[PDB]
């Protein structure tokens, strides 16, 4: 009387502090339950279970959770939706994401793949059962995945279908690389500092892996080929402020004096295209003084050029935009089943 694949409405849990005014804490205080006081992950002896991170309903559930979070929390000076414009108060908020656990209701469990080099689709030989996922931070980003978990063995390439150039590629790193972004005390001009030595080593490793998957062809990195600034720039939110950073220096191939510190030029933007697809939002100027965030680059989103089937190269560019891949990068090893 065991299990079968099934979709069901999950709930969430967290260590949200009831006394906090930080928006993730407020949201999870009234929309999640407390973290499981006694989590028990149970190994399944001699069991093989197949997974598919690209067809996982948990992704869509988390995505709508994060949309609701942002709709309740952020307050634009003016919002631009369709034919109208709605205008309100826009005070500065406290923004800092917290881990969110996802849990099944009665008669359901989460299966978890524990095979170290599991690429996201296919069988898994080391499977356990949990009641909740681990705490996942809902980090909204582009090009680079930040503050995520790490691949435990080798760098892993995740894709629905590597031969289709339209699908997104998720590179899951086995080594954090720090990105340290500050706006010092133009108020909107800022920058991000990255270790050149470490980054170029990791990028070399990503090229060796991509070569493994693409019949030993020459791997070339290129910047995005136009589009809105949210895709052409590494875009993220640091303590309420929307950073747009130029990553051209990260995706040149020459260091694939390139063992110093790379300094990426950034700008804090007040007017953004919402990742919700819902249009345009206008915020207030940034807080006075030093605005600083130190983050772990743990993943990379990549889109591969088409039309090079008859060439000796494959060229890749930082991608993103549809946030669901961000959640996929952390939900890949989980799946709901009905008991």
Please report, as residue ranges, which positions from 121 to 160 form the binding site for ligand MWD (by CB under 6 A): 140-142
**What would the two tokens of residue 63 be?**
């995505």
In this complex, which beta carbon is closest to ligand MWD, that of residue 114 or of residue 280? Answer: 280
Please state, in angstroms and rounded to a whole number, the distance separating the CA atoms of residues 287 and 294: 18
Angle between helices 57-73 and 23-31 (to 10 degrees): 120
Report the residue from 51, 54, 275, 334 that binds ligand MWD according to the rule CB under 6 A.
275
Exactly one of 110, 127, 233, 272 binds ligand MWD (CB under 6 A); which one?
Answer: 272
Question: In the complex, what is the shortest distance from the CB of residue 172 to ligand NAG, in angstroms, rounded to a whole number?
Answer: 10
SS3 of 77-123: the string is CEEEECCEEEECCCCCCCCCCCCEEEECCCCEEEEEECCCCCCCEEE
Q: Which of 25, 56, 235, 298 binds ligand MWD (CB under 6 A)?
A: 235
Q: Which string of DSSP letters, residue by residue, matches 247-260? A: -TTTT-STT---SS
Query: Which of 46, 215, 254, 310 is in the footprint of ligand NAG by CB under 6 A?
Result: 215
Instruction: Answer positive or negative: Cα dihedral of 215, 321, 247, 153.
Output: negative
Query: CB-wise, 34 or 277, nearer to ligand MWD?
Result: 277
Toward ligand MWD, which CB reaches closer, 139 or 331? 139
Q: Which stretch binds ligand NAG (CB under 6 A): 31-39, 80-88, 287-295, 325-333?
A: 287-295
Quick check: helix, strand or coil at residue 27? helix
35 counts as binding ligand MWD under rule CB under 6 A: no
Strands (E), 35-96: 42-43, 49-52, 78-81, 84-87
Query: 215-234: which residues touch ligand MWD (CB under 6 A)?
Result: 228, 230-231
The rounded distance, in Å, linking the Cα atoms of 267 and 149 is 27
Where does the chain have alpha helices with state H? 23-31, 57-73, 196-213, 229-232, 324-331
Phi, psi of 3, rounded to the nearest 5 degrees? -135, 170
Strand (E) or helix (H) holding 130: strand 127-130
The enclosing H or E element of 28 equals: helix 23-31
Q: What binding mask, one character per residue, do residues 112-151 give for ligand NAG by CB under 6 A, x or -?
A: --x----x-xx---x------------x------xx----
Each residue 68-97 as x (binds ligand NAG by CB under 6 A) or -, in order, gives -----------------------------x
51 binds ligand MWD (CB under 6 A): no
Element (H, E) at 200: helix 196-213
Rule CB under 6 A: is residue 164 a binding residue for ligand NAG?
Answer: yes
Q: Are strands 291-304 and 144-146 parallel, antiparallel or unpaired?
A: antiparallel
* Interface residues toward ligand MWD, by CB under 6 A: 140-142, 228, 230-231, 235-237, 242, 272-273, 275, 277, 321-322
Residues that bind ligand NAG (CB under 6 A): 97, 114, 119, 121-122, 126, 139, 146-147, 154-155, 157, 161, 163-164, 174-176, 180, 182, 193, 195, 197-198, 205, 209, 213, 215-216, 232, 236, 238, 246, 248, 261, 293-296
């Amino acid at each position: 009387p065991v299990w079968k694949d099934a979709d069901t409405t999950l709930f969430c849990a967290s260590d949200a502090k009831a006394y906090e005014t930080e928006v993730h804490n407020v949201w999870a205080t009234h929309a999640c339950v407390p973290t499981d006081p006694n989590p028990q992950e149970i190994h399944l002896e001699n069991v093989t279970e197949n997974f598919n991170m690209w067809k996982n309903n948990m992704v869509e559930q988390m995505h709508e959770d994060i949309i609701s979070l942002w709709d309740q929390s952020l307050q634009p000076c003016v919002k631009l939706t369709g034919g109208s414009v709605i205008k309100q108060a826009c005070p500065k908020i406290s923004f800092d994401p917290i881990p969110i656990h996802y849990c099944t209701p009665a008669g359901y469990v989460i299966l978890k793949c524990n095979d170290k080099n599991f690429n996201g689709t296919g069988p898994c030989k080391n499977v356990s059962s949990v009641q909740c996922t681990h705490g996942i931070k809902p980090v909204v980003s582009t090009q680079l995945l930040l503050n995520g978990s790490l691949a435990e063995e080798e760098i892993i390439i995740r894709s629905e279908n590597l031969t289709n150039n339209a699908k997104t590629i998720i590179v899951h790193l086995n080594k954090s690389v720090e990105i340290n972004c500050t706006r010092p005390s133009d108020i909107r001009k800022a920058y991000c500092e990255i270790n050149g030595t470490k980054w170029n080593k990791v990028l070399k490793q990503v090229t060796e892996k991509l070569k493994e998957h693409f019949n030993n062809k020459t791997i070339i990195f290129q910047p995005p080929s136009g589009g809105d600034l949210e895709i052409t720039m590494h875009t993220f939110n640091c303590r309420g402020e929307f950073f747009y950073c130029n990553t051209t220096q990260l995706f040149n191939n020459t260091c694939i004096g390139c063992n110093g510190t790379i300094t990426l030029p950034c700008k804090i933007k007040q007017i953004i295209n919402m990742w919700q697809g819902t249009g345009q939002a206008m915020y207030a100027p940034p807080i006075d003084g030093k605005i600083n965030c130190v983050s772990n680059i743990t993943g990379i989103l990549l889109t591969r050029d088409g039309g090079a089937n008859n060439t000796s190269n494959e060229t890749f560019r930082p991608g993103g935009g549809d946030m669901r891949d961000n959640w996929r990068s952390e939900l890949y090893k989980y799946k709901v089943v009905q008991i």
